[PDB]
Amino acid sequence: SGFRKMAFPSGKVEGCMVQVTCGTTTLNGLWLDDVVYCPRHVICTSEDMLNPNYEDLLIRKSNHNFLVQAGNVQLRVIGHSMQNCVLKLKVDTANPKTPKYKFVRIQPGQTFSVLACYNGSPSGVYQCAMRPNFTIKGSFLNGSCGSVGFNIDYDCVSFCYMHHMELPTGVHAGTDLEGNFYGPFVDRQTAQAAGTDTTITVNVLAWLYAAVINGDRWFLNRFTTTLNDFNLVAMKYNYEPLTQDHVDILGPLSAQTGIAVLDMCASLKELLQNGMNGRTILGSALLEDEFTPFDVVRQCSGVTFQ
Amino acid sequence: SGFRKMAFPSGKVEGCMVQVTCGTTTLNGLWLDDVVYCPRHVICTSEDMLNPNYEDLLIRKSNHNFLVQAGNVQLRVIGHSMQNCVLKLKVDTANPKTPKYKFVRIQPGQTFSVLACYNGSPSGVYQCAMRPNFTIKGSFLNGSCGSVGFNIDYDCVSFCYMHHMELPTGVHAGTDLEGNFYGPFVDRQTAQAAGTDTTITVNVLAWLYAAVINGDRWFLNRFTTTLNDFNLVAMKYNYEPLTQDHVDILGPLSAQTGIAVLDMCASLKELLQNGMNGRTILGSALLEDEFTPFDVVRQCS
Ligand SMILES: O=C1CCC(=O)N1c1ccc(F)cc1F
Numbered sequence A: 001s002g003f004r005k006m007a008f009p010s011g012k013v014e015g016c017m018v019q020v021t022c023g024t025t026t027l028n029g030l031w032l033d034d035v036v037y038c039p040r041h042v043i044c045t046s047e048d049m050l051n052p053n054y055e056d057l058l059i060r061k062s063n064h065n066f067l068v069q070a071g072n073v074q075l076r077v078i079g080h081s082m083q084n085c086v087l088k089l090k091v092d093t094a095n096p097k098t099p100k101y102k103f104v105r106i107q108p109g110q111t112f113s114v115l116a117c118y119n120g121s122p123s124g125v126y127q128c129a130m131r132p133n134f135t136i137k138g139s140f141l142n143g144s145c146g147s148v149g150f151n152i153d154y155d156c157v158s159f160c161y162m163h164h165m166e167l168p169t170g171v172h173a174g175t176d177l178e179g180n181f182y183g184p185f186v187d188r189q190t191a192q193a194a195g196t197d198t199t200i201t202v203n204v205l206a207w208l209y210a211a212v213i214n215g216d217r218w219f220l221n222r223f224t225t226t227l228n229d230f231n232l233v234a235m236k237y238n239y240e241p242l243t244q245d246h247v248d249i250l251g252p253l254s255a256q257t258g259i260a261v262l263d264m265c266a267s268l269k270e271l272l273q274n275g276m277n278g279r280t281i282l283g284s285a286l287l288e289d290e291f292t293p294f295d296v297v298r299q300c301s302g303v304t305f306q
Numbered sequence B: 001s002g003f004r005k006m007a008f009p010s011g012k013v014e015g016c017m018v019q020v021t022c023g024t025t026t027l028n029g030l031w032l033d034d035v036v037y038c039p040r041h042v043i044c045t046s047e048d049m050l051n052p053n054y055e056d057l058l059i060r061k062s063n064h065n066f067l068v069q070a071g072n073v074q075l076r077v078i079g080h081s082m083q084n085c086v087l088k089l090k091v092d093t094a095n096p097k098t099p100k101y102k103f104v105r106i107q108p109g110q111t112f113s114v115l116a117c118y119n120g121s122p123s124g125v126y127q128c129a130m131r132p133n134f135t136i137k138g139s140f141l142n143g144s145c146g147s148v149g150f151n152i153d154y155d156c157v158s159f160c161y162m163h164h165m166e167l168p169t170g171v172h173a174g175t176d177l178e179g180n181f182y183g184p185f186v187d188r189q190t191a192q193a194a195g196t197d198t199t200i201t202v203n204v205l206a207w208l209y210a211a212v213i214n215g216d217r218w219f220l221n222r223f224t225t226t227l228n229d230f231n232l233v234a235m236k237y238n239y240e241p242l243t244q245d246h247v248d249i250l251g252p253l254s255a256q257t258g259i260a261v262l263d264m265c266a267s268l269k270e271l272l273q274n275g276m277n278g279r280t281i282l283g284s285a286l287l288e289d290e291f292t293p294f295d296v297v298r299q300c301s
């Protein structure tokens, strides 16, 4: 029993974290095979960051301008190039701890584990969702740039996020490992507002199923609804639209619990319109939207990653 | 900026997780140097659940009755002994991935990370606290016994918890790594119930300080309180008493924010009285009590 916000075991990624220094700037890099990946803004001074020309800033750098340390051992950089917003430092040694891995770009609403790092040393792990507005509600201090986000499939690490910057509201923006930003952001010191965010409806439903599995049932009711009717409710409450694919993905949980998705949708409609009336669900007084259907099934089934 | 329930990176503990089998029972063990630690109830049969005599069950076992699998490798058991409620299997290989480590018994209110495991393979990592009633609110399925809780200081792993059982309310009970249970619980299936649980007051205050550090002040007020009046109020909400130890521990956070500890207590008193009135604090609509003062300083720096 029990339901917790759970990250993937982080060991496979810890073995890949290194420290990258360029000038007066130190941040984190990801060492896989013989390449270290890090944010391209490592090469900027603070005035550069005001309006950077990254290709021009880079031409002026030699390989020896990039100090890379894996633990206590220096790595020799032998090449350097940019892919979108990610700098790629070719090194003379392949990481012997390289796991089976892929670079994947995730969709808003999907969750992943963040390994927060400083000076190349992992400091904490936590679970995030890519918000509909393409930010993440992370916890990062100065020095955390280059920390990465990931999922694990079987023994394969799917890297999906590299941390680049914080927005004025205190939420976070970054790229995939091919350097493409999530969201309408640019790597430049300018204030850049996140758009108004919405709630991830399919994930709220998954969490309500998690609640039921764990014996928390007070919000169930006799009613059902239609997609069209429910989606008018969702739009009114700044929830994301629920699609038929969302319904299909929740199929397993509907069959396991005896609560059809539209049946559960009628529970959510009543919760939106009436509130919780002083009650909680899985210990929360808010409707939680950072568990995916897969997260719920995996945690209520005990899948492992040795 | 930001504030998350954050666990320690789990890799140092992942390298120690093994599978222990005895009879038809499989659970997890912790392999450190040449010893594997696991719950002693791995030797129980279906008839031994209510009143097992562990000394009598153990004397009947040979080293080769214990199967210990590390990855795809069988380890050889060359000795066994019982320490309180934990079995120690001596094996013929020192774990080459053994981190710097210690065993530390914790007090209620302390937090730690849990690496949930099944069949010797890690599943997920999350953050827990030792509740005042000596249980933890974990996420554990059948097969998770032997999963451990830990903190990491510098690069030294402090192991503080080994999972043994789930109580009828769905909360969890286990031991330190010397095999002594937290709380009044025993490794028998006789009826046991956790005490009424209470809120960890010092941790709530730490978390309110985190909220101020991250830029939120809406819940403060112009008032203060005596320590005794605060405790008289807070216990009516099933909050733990706040001690002078707790007030002293909150000194650093008070100094950083400029809010005296008893002034923060006055804020808490008002929040218990008023609710949040539709607002949130660090993204929560309830008061959070599983961050310690030490956690807050480490995360907000
Ligand atoms: O430097 C950056 C990159 C992203 C962004 O929005 N900012 C920023 C600028 C000015 C501020 F006052 C606060 C900020 F977060």
Ligand SMILES: [Cl-]
Pocket: A222, A223, A224, A225
């Ligand atoms: Cl109906």
Ligand SMILES: [Cl-]
Pocket: A283, A284, A285, A286, B283, B284, B285, B286
């Ligand atoms: Cl909440």
Ligand code: NA
Pocket: A220, A221, A222, A223, A224, A262, A263, A264, A266, A267
């Ligand atoms: Na219903």
Ligand code: NA
Pocket: A306, B014, B016, B017, B018, B019, B070, B071, B120, B121, B122
């Ligand atoms: Na293992």
